[PDB]
Amino acid sequence: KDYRKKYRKYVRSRFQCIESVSLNKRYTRLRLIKEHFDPDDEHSEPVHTVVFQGAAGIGKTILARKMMLDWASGTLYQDRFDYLFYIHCREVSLVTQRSLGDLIMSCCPDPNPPIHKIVRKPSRILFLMDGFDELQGAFDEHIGPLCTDWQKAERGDILLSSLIRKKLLPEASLLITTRPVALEKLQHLLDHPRHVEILGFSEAKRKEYFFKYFSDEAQARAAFSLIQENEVLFTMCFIPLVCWIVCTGLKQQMESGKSLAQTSKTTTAVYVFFLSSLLQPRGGLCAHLWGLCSLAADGIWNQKILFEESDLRNHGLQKADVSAFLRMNLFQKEVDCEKFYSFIHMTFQEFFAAMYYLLERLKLPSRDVTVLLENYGKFEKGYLIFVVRFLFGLVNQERTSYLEKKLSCKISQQIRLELLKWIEVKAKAKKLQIQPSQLELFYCLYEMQEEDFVQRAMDYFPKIEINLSTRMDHMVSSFCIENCHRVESLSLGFLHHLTSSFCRGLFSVLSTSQSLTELDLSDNSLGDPGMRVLCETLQHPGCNIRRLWLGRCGLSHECCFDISLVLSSNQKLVELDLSDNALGDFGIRLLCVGLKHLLCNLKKLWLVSCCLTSACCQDLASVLSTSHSLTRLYVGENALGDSGVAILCEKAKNPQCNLQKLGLVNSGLTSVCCSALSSVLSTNQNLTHLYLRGNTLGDKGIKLLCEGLLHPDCKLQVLELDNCNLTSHCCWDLSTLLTSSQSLRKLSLGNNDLGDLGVMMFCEVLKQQSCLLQNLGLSEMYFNYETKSALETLQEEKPELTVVFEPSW
Amino acid sequence: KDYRKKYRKYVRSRFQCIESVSLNKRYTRLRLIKEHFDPDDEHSEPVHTVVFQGAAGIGKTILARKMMLDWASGTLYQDRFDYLFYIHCREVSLVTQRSLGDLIMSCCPDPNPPIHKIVRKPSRILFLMDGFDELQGAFDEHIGPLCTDWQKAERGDILLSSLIRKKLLPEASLLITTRPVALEKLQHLLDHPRHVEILGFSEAKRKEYFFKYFSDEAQARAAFSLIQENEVLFTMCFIPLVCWIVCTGLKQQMESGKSLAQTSKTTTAVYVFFLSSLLQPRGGLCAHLWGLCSLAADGIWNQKILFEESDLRNHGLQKADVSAFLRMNLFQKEVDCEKFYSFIHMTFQEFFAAMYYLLERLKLPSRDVTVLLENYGKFEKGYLIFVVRFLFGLVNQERTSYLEKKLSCKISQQIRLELLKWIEVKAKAKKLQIQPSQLELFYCLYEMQEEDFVQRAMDYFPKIEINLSTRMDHMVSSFCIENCHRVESLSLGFLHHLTSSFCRGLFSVLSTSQSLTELDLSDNSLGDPGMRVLCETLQHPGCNIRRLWLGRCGLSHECCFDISLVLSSNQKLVELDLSDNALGDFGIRLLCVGLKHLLCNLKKLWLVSCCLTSACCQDLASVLSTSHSLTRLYVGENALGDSGVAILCEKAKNPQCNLQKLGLVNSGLTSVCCSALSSVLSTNQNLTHLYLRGNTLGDKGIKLLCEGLLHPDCKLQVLELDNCNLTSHCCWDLSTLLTSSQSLRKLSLGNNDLGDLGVMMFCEVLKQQSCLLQNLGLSEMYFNYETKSALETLQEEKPELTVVFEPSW
Numbered sequence A, B: 001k002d003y004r005k006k007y008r009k010y011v012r013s014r015f016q017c018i019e020s021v022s023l024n025k026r027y028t029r030l031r032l033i034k035e036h037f038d039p040d041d042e043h044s045e046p047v048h049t050v051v052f053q054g055a056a057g058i059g060k061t062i063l064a065r066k067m068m069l070d071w072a073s074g075t076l077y078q079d080r081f082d083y084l085f086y087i088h089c090r091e092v093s094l095v096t097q098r099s100l101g102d103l104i105m106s107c108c109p110d111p112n113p114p115i116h117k118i119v120r121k122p123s124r125i126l127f128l129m130d131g132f133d134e135l136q137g138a139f140d141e142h143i144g145p146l147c148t149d150w151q152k153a154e155r156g157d158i159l160l161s162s163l164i165r166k167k168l169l170p171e172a173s174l175l176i177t178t179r180p181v182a183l184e185k186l187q188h189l190l191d192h193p194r195h196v197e198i199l200g201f202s203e204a205k206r207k208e209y210f211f212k213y214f215s216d217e218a219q220a221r222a223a224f225s226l227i228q229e230n231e232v233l234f235t236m237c238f239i240p241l242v243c244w245i246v247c248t249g250l251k252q253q254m255e256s257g258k259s260l261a262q263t264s265k266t267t268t269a270v271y272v273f274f275l276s277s278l279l280q281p282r283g284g285l286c287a288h289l290w291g292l293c294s295l296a297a298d299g300i301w302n303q304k305i306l307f308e309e310s311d312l313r314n315h316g317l318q319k320a321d322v323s324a325f326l327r328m329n330l331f332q333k334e335v336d337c338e339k340f341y342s343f344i345h346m347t348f349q350e351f352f353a354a355m356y357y358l359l360e361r362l363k364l365p366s367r368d369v370t371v372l373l374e375n376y377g378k379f380e381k382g383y384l385i386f387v388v389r390f391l392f393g394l395v396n397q398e399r400t401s402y403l404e405k406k407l408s409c410k411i412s413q414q415i416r417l418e419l420l421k422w423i424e425v426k427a428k429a430k431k432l433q434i435q436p437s438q439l440e441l442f443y444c445l446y447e448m449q450e451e452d453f454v455q456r457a458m459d460y461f462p463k464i465e466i467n468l469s470t471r472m473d474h475m476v477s478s479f480c481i482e483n484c485h486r487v488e489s490l491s492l493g494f495l496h497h498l499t500s501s502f503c504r505g506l507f508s509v510l511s512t513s514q515s516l517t518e519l520d521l522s523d524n525s526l527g528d529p530g531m532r533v534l535c536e537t538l539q540h541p542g543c544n545i546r547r548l549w550l551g552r553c554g555l556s557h558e559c560c561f562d563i564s565l566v567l568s569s570n571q572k573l574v575e576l577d578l579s580d581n582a583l584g585d586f587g588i589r590l591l592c593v594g595l596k597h598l599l600c601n602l603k604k605l606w607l608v609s610c611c612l613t614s615a616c617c618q619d620l621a622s623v624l625s626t627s628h629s630l631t632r633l634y635v636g637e638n639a640l641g642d643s644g645v646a647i648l649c650e651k652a653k654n655p656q657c658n659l660q661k662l663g664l665v666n667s668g669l670t671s672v673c674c675s676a677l678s679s680v681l682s683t684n685q686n687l688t689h690l691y692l693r694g695n696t697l698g699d700k701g702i703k704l705l706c707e708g709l710l711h712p713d714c715k716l717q718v719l720e721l722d723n724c725n726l727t728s729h730c731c732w733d734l735s736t737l738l739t740s741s742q743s744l745r746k747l748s749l750g751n752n753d754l755g756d757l758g759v760m761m762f763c764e765v766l767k768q769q770s771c772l773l774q775n776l777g778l779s780e781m782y783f784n785y786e787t788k789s790a791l792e793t794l795q796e797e798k799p800e801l802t803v804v805f806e807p808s809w
């Protein structure tokens, strides 16, 4: 326990501060949301691998630093662990250099007790691989297959591959911080992992950070109020990095007397204005920017985050100017372990990477943007998600004084057309390219802030599919849909803001969109309060939404009260889907009130899998009689029995009824309803379709059911009847109906266990020039060899129809 | 759970019927006797391999079919298993064709979800390898040693070897149906198996089957009564296959008006008469029989169960005649999977195999029967157990009209001599050939039904050893022993019919057998009711049984009452053995009553290990005095102490006593009985032998014991005394007796721990021309190197004796 105490004390001094203010002081709690969560037990469960997902600047880099100092005081994991090893991927040089040297280099200059005594018990070491996205070089998916020898690997790729696969040291605890875009590489290597998402700051947390940052509270409230006054900056301060930048810029200009919350349109504006405040006291510089942007170019082109002294002089800098750049945090990143250089944050290097593409040494901007645009997704050059974003933002001539007139409009205008061309290229890309997602493009599109450009750029969006996670994700999407005049089908994806104070802003966009026709909100956890504000927006005049799908939503009975209102007011809804909702007979009782109103004109309606009984049939029958606009009504999967169908059918036998479709799949059925169904078929005269499946229809019921179908003036075109208990003894009646009735088009009898004699009873009746012309479904039916070939030859005899049996898949 | 439901439904339709009547209707319970049993739990215990033993036609083939349909409804093994695979060994072509293709071919034509998703978890698949006896080709004991690769084996022998050994798929559940003759191949491959024997129908079950078969119950009782009237057919209807054949033949002739239960002598008669009813409506045919018998010949010669279209035309058939053969079940076996052909049952193919050997294309009957008779047991050509049986039966010119006069008597007469010669060849075979067992020959001999032929054929049976299992096994043996006039020693083996209604028929045979002398009923579970009927038969005059052995039988005290009766009546018993029976002092009290009767003359008597005490010694002493015929009495292993011996000896010291032998091995003994034993030795004058061993004889007892032996007029010839606690201090007295008494012949002192000085005390006394001439046992005694060689040289000096010490084994 000698060196164990020394190592534990050694970590305390190194990580006391982040390279000034105590880390124990300014640190605040982050949203440790467990992706399918106490800071105590990331490793309580026998899962021995944890991965952290977080966007750039969300605080992954220093979350581990707080975790390791918090360990060093014994407050976190004092029992299962007494050794912690920090693996900074930024400093890692993995191109055939490193051995297990990671262990000696971390502890102390060169002691080797732990290299032998500590490696013995594997439950004593975990590895904190910070920033796997910040890996440098070409990381092939598979390098160094055979790797088990302990002390000698000598290959950086082997070390990372083996340690992740837990082959170098079996039973090894891991906790790695990865950017969410990098999970594609992880999925090749992860084996039974645990995924945790890292969010940012809350409104209360933002106020706490400002108090913990501003020493003089007299202006802290004034600065916070100025920050709180802005609506875009405040919601952009969920990322802690932005809070640091706005605080530094305000405090840097505090000696000058300026503010920051005026040019807070997008991410480019706040960083460019920071660079304004980063250079307004300071200032040649563009060449120094050229010296570093090109250094930041090949630093992402060839993946060189760290900067050498020779590289510093290679592009051409001044040590005093570098120190001037150091002293007030341009990059200010000099490693204490050895004399190297780095940028302050990842977005700053990528911000200057886009600066090179707009200034006017390895890839020219105009010609090599196109190869970059197709190199955008390739991990070989890292990920350039922010590279284009700042490039997209910067061309909009941000209102900063000396960030407009030192760059050239000739390239920027050419860039605008190239970016506009690229958006269409990605939009028309049929293949499901994961990295240039529609949401990611909207992030760049929101960064435009140009009204006419986004109008023409987004006009290449016929179908919009959006998944949302954060509050900022709502505003970026809101700015797009508010001026998309060519959108036809739209959808939303929620995974978290469902309160009416948040979804109202986005939902208000839909009501004011003329081109919008379809809304797909299915498979979401949108609750009743969220549903209530949706109906408020739908009542707005001019809402051209026609068809909405609300399947699998968390809707309950009390939501139907609002839906009855929009039907009684809006006449644009034509198709409404409420399948898979836990609304009882009371919900239909409220819903049927709105449908009975003569103002509404609804044609289609889905109530599949809704918790319903025979009681709702009485209420729904009234609508079926008076609602002239109701044509199709798929009410299958419900628990209503034969009693409910009798009530529904007795009102559906009116010759003036408009019910042209009806589905009763898997609903409790017997042979009694066949008599009622027979009566409506001969009297309705326009029941074009009728779907039955999975029922318990009486074996004798078909005899009663066909009694009504044999009536001349019936126009049933499609009949589906599967999984019903049938026997070959009644198969004769099926043949009689098939030959007699000419209205039928396609009839399917799926997996209905009937004798092979009845199948051959159909062979001649089809050969007798019958009236079944479209399809005949007999799938999931097994016959012998001599029976199977008999149906095959009839296919060629009658090419006008297509018999559907299942000898294959 | 998509394809799992489809597969489960797929099995239901395929196996609903056995290629007409519902399998759910006519199926009835079979005797699922567990060989060392609910249909619920064959696989409850962690044993992961089950093998089923059953004779041909007992129902192994369709027992699995019922099991798999019963599974398909979820009634059997719904939890541990959801996938069942049927491996029909008849259809298996194992000569370097098959891959894992067994899995795709069974499910559906060609889907491959289960080939990848289902093979993952081995606790999801079991294999139903039906009829391992029906394997075709040369099955070597060891083919394909290395076999672990999953998807590619390509060798049929490798697949069967690996799957049985559970190497292709570790942790695999197996349930295989095998004919009992085939266990020799199984024992090479089985690893921790579970064996279950399958019996047939009961009398009540036979009645139930007739009711379930005959639609019109008016004649079902009449047909059953006609069946029940026959005594051989009814007991032959324990096999379900025979029930099917007799029912079909009666129903086939029901349109004609004939019966079946008149030519029911043997298995050949019922099948030949079935073939009569199989051809009386039909009928050229012999050539068609020649076309199929030769096809059935090379189908067992080269092991080709399945018949090809080319093979059908190769021998020469007619498709209409084949269809005529199909339509009323000659073989009627066309596979639904593919257009092949097969025989209806295994015995039918082997019945026609013997038909070729009696008609007049690959093995001539007369010359190649002899090679067949030595190829009878070789598994290379399958097993020909039924081939000879029908051949043995058919030569007896069965009373069928057109089954006598189309065949040639010239070959049949030559066959008779060859079969008669073969029986002697197998009878004189000293080696323990397992397959041509004595019981199996009697099965063929019973099928003769020829009085004079079986007389001369069985005259080559000096010793008869029979093991019986079923009721039919009793009648086949009964028909043999009833006319065996040269039997000397006979034995029975029971493993199940012990009720007096069954064993009486066989036991009545023994009483009427003149040549019979010895009966060995030892090591059986023959109870008192079975013992009671045995004594009833023994009282029959003319019973020439002299010596009976009844060791390890389940006899109790109440059986001795019957045994006392046969002794008081029959004067032929000379040797009676009752060793290892749980009969108390009361049993001897009843037994001694019969022995005291002057009519009985019993010489030898064994009461070893019987639960006895000193009380029985008083009763047994009276017999020892009055029973003049009693000479030897081995009453060792009993719990009687020294007190009992005193009572027994005090009556045994009479000079007129005839007790020439007496054994008291392991009975509780002390030094007190030596005085009584000394008194009898000097007075009895004819106690030739006296055996002692494992006692607690007093160390000083030998001094008292030798006191009587030193008397001149004593004629003790053999004395055995082992395991008695002895010391070298008394070893001097042993030497004095050895030199003095001239009556002793062989004296053994086994493992009696005495000093090496006493052994050398005997070295000189033997060298002094002593009177010990036959043997001197000193086994289980350990001496040093210089002591061991001293006894070795004395062996060559005196070749007239053989010292018995144990330096080796």
Ligand SMILES: Nc1ncnc2c1ncn2[C@@H]1O[C@H](COP(=O)(O)OP(=O)(O)O)[C@@H](O)[C@H]1O
Residues within 6 Å of the ligand: A026, A027, A028, A029, A030, A055, A056, A057, A058, A059, A060, A061, A062, A063, A131, A209, A240, A241, A244, A345, A346
């Ligand atoms: N919990 C926190 N409290 C205060 N500031 C934070 C916190 N987390 C991150 N930061 C700010 O983020 C900056 C560093 O971000 P970093 O963790 O390096 O981002 P990344 O994880 O993407 O590399 C620091 O300047 C720091 O001020």
Ligand SMILES: Nc1ncnc2c1ncn2[C@@H]1O[C@H](COP(=O)(O)OP(=O)(O)O)[C@@H](O)[C@H]1O
Residues within 6 Å of the ligand: B026, B027, B028, B029, B030, B055, B056, B057, B058, B059, B060, B061, B062, B063, B131, B209, B240, B241, B244, B345, B346
């Ligand atoms: N439980 C049963 N009930 C009725 N018949 C049976 C039963 N078991 C077997 N059978 C009869 O046996 C015949 C098939 O025998 P099989 O099982 O093929 O014999 P093996 O198992 O020796 O191949 C069928 O014709 C059937 O009538």
